[PDB]
Amino acid sequence: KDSDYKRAEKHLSSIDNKWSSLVKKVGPCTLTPHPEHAPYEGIIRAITSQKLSDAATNSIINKFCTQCSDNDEFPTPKQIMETDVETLHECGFSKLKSQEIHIVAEAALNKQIPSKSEIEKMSEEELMESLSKIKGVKRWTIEMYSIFTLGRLDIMPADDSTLKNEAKEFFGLSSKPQTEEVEKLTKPCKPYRTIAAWYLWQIPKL
């Protein structure tokens, strides 16, 4: 793990110079995923973050945990179904999201969601095909779940708006790059594209 990061960092330092320079300035990767979280939880967290900064997302989850739980633990599927969308909406979840998070909890209850062990065996493509069946869960949301919950190392969220902005100046492009362009420009980062994206994400912090 922290060993994967050593290897990852060395690899990004063996590509072209700009990558080597970014690693040195930003320093050690501090990305901390949470694979212990059950599928329905990581998915709800990813859904919540849609269109929202980490800070906003976190204040919303903080409330969700404080209200819909006792020991400020992440609400269980049953606790989630026992809450109405109006109440969920008061936590900061959009009305649409409140409905989707509701379906997700119900699905976890009825074992309609792939189990963790089964998710652990799915390639990203299979994972994409599987979870995309869930309302409110698509490419962006599934990459975020793969990165922050699952801890996969070769995930390049080329479709992330912020990453594209950071990619634009990192690669000195004339205009914000399309998704496919970010895809091939970061090809050399394999098999640690997650770490590559993390580093591009730290650029504002400089």
Place this chain on the structure above:
DNA sequence: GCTACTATCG
């Protein structure tokens, strides 16, 4: 002080 900053549905 003010604003800009995913995926779905009538």
Place this chain on the structure above:
DNA sequence: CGATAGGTAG
């Protein structure tokens, strides 16, 4: 189409 979640950097 065109609303829609909110903390906070600029």
